[PDB]
Amino acid sequence: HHPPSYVAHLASDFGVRVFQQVAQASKDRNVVFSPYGVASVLAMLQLTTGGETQQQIQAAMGFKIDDKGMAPALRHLYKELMGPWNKDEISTTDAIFVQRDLKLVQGFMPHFFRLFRSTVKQVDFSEVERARFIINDWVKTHTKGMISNLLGKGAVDQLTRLVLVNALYFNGQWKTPFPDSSTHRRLFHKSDGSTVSVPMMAQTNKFNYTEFTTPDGHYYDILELPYHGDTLSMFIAAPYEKEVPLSALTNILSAQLISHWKGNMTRLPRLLVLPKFSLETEVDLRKPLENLGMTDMFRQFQADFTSLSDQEPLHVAQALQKVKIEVNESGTAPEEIIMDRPFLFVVRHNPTGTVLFMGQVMEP
């Protein structure tokens, strides 16, 4: 039993279930998402909520953040992901920005630090633009300039009292990069039947590969692309038959299925043709979270934030995630696998089982 891994699996399972809701909502749009990111934010939300509100979050996540033994398990998980032995870079930081004159429950600040290894930041939301800049700047710094305008105008106002954020940054280099010379434009077939010409990378190598079947009989390829540090990998999956929609896969997705893919892999020679892409999406998490049973936190008269403060009633006004990803050749006879149709991708830290990023590429 390895506690950091146990927590990583629960967090990933929850995060993938949230993605599933998002995918089903926007079935034909590009979606880049962070399962670990949403789990981190909801974990902090557990500490600030109480009563039935906290109970709904805990039921959905499958664990309680304040159980005896969670602090070191979480502390160690952070270290497992960010350790130099990974070679590939991962940086994750949690932060809480709270209205300065808001009276906090005693022992909250120490408790928050113990679990999230970050100190509570106090701002004045009455000076709207100032507070918005402070938060946006913090995020920009912690995502190395990639996410520069997290909170748009109107996202926060004078009635805002609390902002919870997780900044996640990943920089990896392929174990075997794609030859720059092999890249050229090829046709990608969109779900609506249209066709676009996009730059596609190509590489022949012995890849860890496996083929699964959906419960209704459609086979799909899963291929693993490891990063140079050997602890992180990107899995790409897509139906074999071009007539089968990607939704057939997103509907059966789970953290366990992803583990099963990795466990069933065999190193086989394959020619891989994969589109290079640069995606940025902002997803509203309100409906996906309500669908998983977290309804109270969004309601002015039902939400319970007494674990944070008794002073005044609070409620979640907005819950969203902004993610950005760029995939290219290099960073910082074999059967053919051509991703010239919508496909799924998953970035995973294999030792812990942490699903950091995932998404559906509907149009490169």
Partner: peptide, 5 residues
């Protein structure tokens, strides 16, 4: 790959 959330 470069990614941020």
């Amino acid at each position: 790959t470069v990614a941020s959330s």
